[PDB]
């Protein structure tokens, strides 16, 4: 299944959508995770909050102004740290006449106008806020509250975060932490752009990514964990690395694989709400995770290996496990599918 890796959509009925981790199975027994990225779109009754005319006063305690360096489809971003702001504060500044979004007709023309001048005047993320928008009552697809075998490691990836977007912020090329899964929801807003690699191709990135930062590549085993490094689809298509592009609009989910490259962009004003989960599939990912050395987060993989592979403790403590990870298997959940 999905033996071309593009970007799939799934449209789940309230059923289907009830349980978080059975439909994760379900898109990958589709092939979803061989994209890296999928998008879901919610079933039009469910709502993860009534309303959002009420979270002004919320504190964004480290806004980040965006800096970024490059040329020719290659740029380094670096992040300044600005004082808290509130959500008020932070839309009186996204929609002001310095920083609000171009006039566009479609979305190949704001692409254009993105990555012509994301080096020109540094806009403000209001990015990594722990946080939910989520009602309390709200059982399905609740990023706060998940409950996927992620939680082993608790019973700081495991809760919520709150991204306040403008037009040109901007997350650089990365996988998650312990190349774990992710989920990210656009709560309201303009949209959010993604591009994305298939984890089946990634190392190609990395090898690319290499060759173009020799110096960061030489200080760090994995510099794109630091996720400062942007490059344009245009010099991905240069150097015939596959990827796939995406837009996530105002109540869409976006779910990111194990070892799913992706970058992308804020069209404007927006917030997105995102956490880190697992299923049985990830375990040899976290086991098999090549991380940051000059620096990081760590999750000892040790519980995992214990409850789910006991059989296979006593070699892996060793450092004799030999698995070869096949990008293109889905979760043994996906089994009933
Ligand atoms: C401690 N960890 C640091 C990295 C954090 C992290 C990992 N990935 N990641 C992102 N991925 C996808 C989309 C977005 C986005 O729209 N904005 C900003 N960051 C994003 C953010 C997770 C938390
Ligand atoms: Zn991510
Ligand atoms: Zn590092």
């Given at each position: 299944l999905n033996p071309s890796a593009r970007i799939m959509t799934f449209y789940p009925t309230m059923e289907e959508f009830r349980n978080f981790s059975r439909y994760i199975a379900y898109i990958e027994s589709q092939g979803a995770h061989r994209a890296g990225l999928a998008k879901?779109?919610?079933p039009k009754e469910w709502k993860p909050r009534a309303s959002y005319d009420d979270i002004d006063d919320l504190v964004i305690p480290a806004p980040i102004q965006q800096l970024v360096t490059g040329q020719s489809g290659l740029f380094t971003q670096?992040?300044?740290?600005?004082?808290?702001?509130?959500?008020?504060?932070?839309?009186?500044?996204?929609?002001?006449?310095?920083?609000c979004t171009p006039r566009y007709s479609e979305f190949e023309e704001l692409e254009r106008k993105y990555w012509k001048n994301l080096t020109f005047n540094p806009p403000i993320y209001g990015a990594d806020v722990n946080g939910t928008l989520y009602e309390k009552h709200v059982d399905e697809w609740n990023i706060g509250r998940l409950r996927t075998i992620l939680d082993l490691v608790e019973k700081g990836?495991?809760?919520?975060?709150?991204?306040?977007?403008?037009?040109?912020?901007?997350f650089?090329?990365?996988?998650?932490?312990?190349?774990?899964?992710?989920?990210?929801?656009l709560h309201f807003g303009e949209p959010k752009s993604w591009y994305s690699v298939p984890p089946e191709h990634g190392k190609r990135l990395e090898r690319l990514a290499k060759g173009f930062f020799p110096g960061s590549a030489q200080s760090c085993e994995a510099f794109l964990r630091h996720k400062m490094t942007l490059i344009s689809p245009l010099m991905l298509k240069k150097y015939g690395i596959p990827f796939d592009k995406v837009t996530q609009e105002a109540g869409e989910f976006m779910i990111t694989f194990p070892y799913g490259?992706?970058?992308g962009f804020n069209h404007g004003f927006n917030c997105a709400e995102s956490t880190n989960?697992?299923?049985?599939?990830?375990?040899?990912?976290?086991?098999?995770?090549?991380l940051c050395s000059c620096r990081m987060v760590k999750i000892s993989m040790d519980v995992f290996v214990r409850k789910f592979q006991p059989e296979r403790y006593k070699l892996w403590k060793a450092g004799k496990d030999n698995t070869v990870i096949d990008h293109t298997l889905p979760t043994p959940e996906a089994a009933e599918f």
């Open positions: 879901v779109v919610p670096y992040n300044i740290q600005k004082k808290a702001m509130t959500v008020r504060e932070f839309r009186k500044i996204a929609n002001s006449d310095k920083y990836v495991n809760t919520p975060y709150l991204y306040f977007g403008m037009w040109k912020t901007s650089a090329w990365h996988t998650e932490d312990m190349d774990l899964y992710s989920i990210n929801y490259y992706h970058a989960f697992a299923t049985r599939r990830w375990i040899e990912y976290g086991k098999q995770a090549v």
